[PDB]
């Protein structure tokens, strides 16, 4: 009930398979003075090693068809087939604590301007009178109102978030827009 | 120092254990013309394979007591014993970029209404005068103010977020409330 | 079958390959125990083990994939997470759904008056109480000048000193007396 392999103290002992003259795979204690135990394909160069404080495989690791990658990323059906890094980015609001100017100029009553970021469901700050930032969080394309410094601004988000239009304002003309980074 | 297994080129070579007449487990290169090396239980049908570009197990994979599931979900004490998908959902604000109406009507000064979701710590838009949406983010049940289109609205979130009351308004009567999806 | 290394045992009895160096049990592979079909690759010296069981495979210690690590508490470390553990990457990268708030200042700051607040208020959700006992919401950006038509009239305020300073620049009948912040 035991196939007994015996070597001298601290000497290698492993099972080696060769097909033809080719080293194919091995399992066991591959080196003298080293107690790591390895299961290795020479042909694939793919390895599992039992080491002192952990086990390791040297390439990506599949669990069924889910994948644990060598960079620590995970892919599987639970993440909608995405890698986890992308699932997270798409799924949850980023704590960037940074903003970006998407537009600068002057947009009086009736004037529509155009930006290269989708402004829908974003945190924005609009600068109108008195060199202050007026906060707003947009929903989808639509009509919004803010009692911005100077008086007030009624504005429209249109064109799938790329259009920003001053519908009407009372002494509160937008001259800059920042957006919180995603 | 080596147990040497030798085969013809590209022929299977493996070690097979049988208990009585039952195939029980094997290790090695299980098939001709295929360099994949496998450690397999025939009884359990549970397998580790070393392949060209990855190593793979065919069922859920435990690391101590933590679990990496075949769908890519992970369970562990670091996630409070939850699966990671649920930890994430519970822990972080959802980037849903979508909204839902929670009430529609007319709530003049003093009028209280029931809303369809708990509005505490939520992103909301209230429509009052002039067909525009006024943004607000609520905290707990309490008293809030917004200089909404038309003038202003002092409002109350009550009844564990299920009640919305117009305390007072100046020419700014609410008629619709949207909430950002969670 | 003459070119397979065949290990044959009685039904439901252990059979494994054991390697010993000198007198020391060093490693084994196979069916370690009677009446039990679990198959194990184990180092006796390291005490590190892989086991194939009925419904799962298991390693008994942290498991590395290249240099990435899946720990026994379910945490993951890797270059994708900036070399951080995923728990910290998540905490640092994404907005907490805390649904709770904390008071960061209480007092009375009229026009021109500046106060110290107890948290960095940059890129935070805050609520300022001015006139009429109501909360006025604002989300801040970095240090800078901001405006809110808060209950009473309006308030132009400044976040300064790396988020630790709050100054009433000017107000119209809307003097701040308390500020709450959403918990991170």
């Amino acid at each position: 009930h035991v196939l007994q392999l015996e070597s001298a103290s601290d000497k290698a002992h492993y099972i080696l398979s060769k097909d033809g003259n080719r080293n194919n795979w091995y399992i066991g204690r591959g080196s003298d003075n080293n107690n790591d135990c390895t299961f290795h394909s020479y042909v694939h160069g793919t390895t599992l090693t039992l080491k002192q404080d952990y086990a390791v495989v040297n390439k990506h690791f599949h669990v069924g068809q889910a994948v644990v990658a060598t960079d620590g990323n995970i892919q599987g059906t639970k993440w909608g087939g995405k890698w986890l890094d992308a699932y997270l980015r798409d799924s949850f609001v980023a704590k960037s604590k940074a903003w970006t100017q998407v537009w600068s100029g002057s947009a009086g009553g009736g004037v529509s301007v155009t930006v290269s970021q989708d402004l829908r469901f974003r945190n924005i700050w609009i600068k109108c009178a008195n060199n202050s930032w007026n906060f707003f969080r947009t929903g989808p394309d639509g009509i919004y109102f803010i009692a911005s410094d100077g008086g007030w601004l009624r504005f429209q988000i249109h064109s799938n978030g790329l259009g920003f239009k001053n519908i009407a304002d009372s002494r509160s003309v937008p001259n800059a827009i920042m957006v919180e980074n995603e």
Side-chain angles (χ1 to χ4, degrees), chain A residues 84-131:
Chain A
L84 184 57
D85 78 305
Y87 172 93
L88 294 169
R89 194 180 308 110
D90 292 353
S91 293
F92 302 107
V93 179
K95 184 184 176 184
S96 61
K97 308 203 172 169
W99 70 1
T100 297
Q101 178 184 108
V102 298
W103 177 85
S104 181
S106 181
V111 176
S112 181
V113 303
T114 318
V115 299
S116 65
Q117 286 202 43
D118 182 343
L119 297 179
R120 293 176 294 175
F121 286 101
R122 297 297 293 280
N123 293 332
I124 69 166
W125 291 260
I126 306 160
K127 185 178 281 173
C128 299
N130 304 305
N131 210 28

Side-chain angles (χ1 to χ4, degrees), chain A residues 151-162:
Chain A
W152 54 262
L153 171 69
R154 191 169 309 106
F155 68 95
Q156 177 185 23
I157 302 296
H158 63 84
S159 300
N160 289 348
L162 306 175

Side-chain angles (χ1 to χ4, degrees), chain A residues 44-64:
Chain A
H44 289 336
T46 299
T47 317
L48 162 77
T49 314
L50 306 176
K51 291 176 72 83
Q52 186 172 312
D53 291 319
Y54 58 91
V56 51
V57 295
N58 70 328
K59 283 179 186 176
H60 308 314
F61 186 66
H62 299 203
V63 177

Side-chain angles (χ1 to χ4, degrees), chain A residues 22-97:
Chain A
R22 185 180 48 179
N23 276 354
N24 197 281
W25 62 267
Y26 85 93
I27 191 162
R29 183 177 66 263
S31 291
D32 297 339
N33 304 303
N34 181 339
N35 290 303
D36 297 352
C37 292
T38 307
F39 180 27
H40 175 69
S41 170
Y42 295 99
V43 179
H44 289 336
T46 299
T47 317
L48 162 77
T49 314
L50 306 176
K51 291 176 72 83
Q52 186 172 312
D53 291 319
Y54 58 91
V56 51
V57 295
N58 70 328
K59 283 179 186 176
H60 308 314
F61 186 66
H62 299 203
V63 177
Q65 307 200 117
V67 184
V68 178
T70 56
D71 64 5
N73 216 344
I74 310 307
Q75 185 187 69
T77 60
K78 194 72 203 174
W79 315 121
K82 296 174 175 179
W83 288 96
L84 184 57
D85 78 305
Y87 172 93
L88 294 169
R89 194 180 308 110
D90 292 353
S91 293
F92 302 107
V93 179
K95 184 184 176 184
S96 61
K97 308 203 172 169

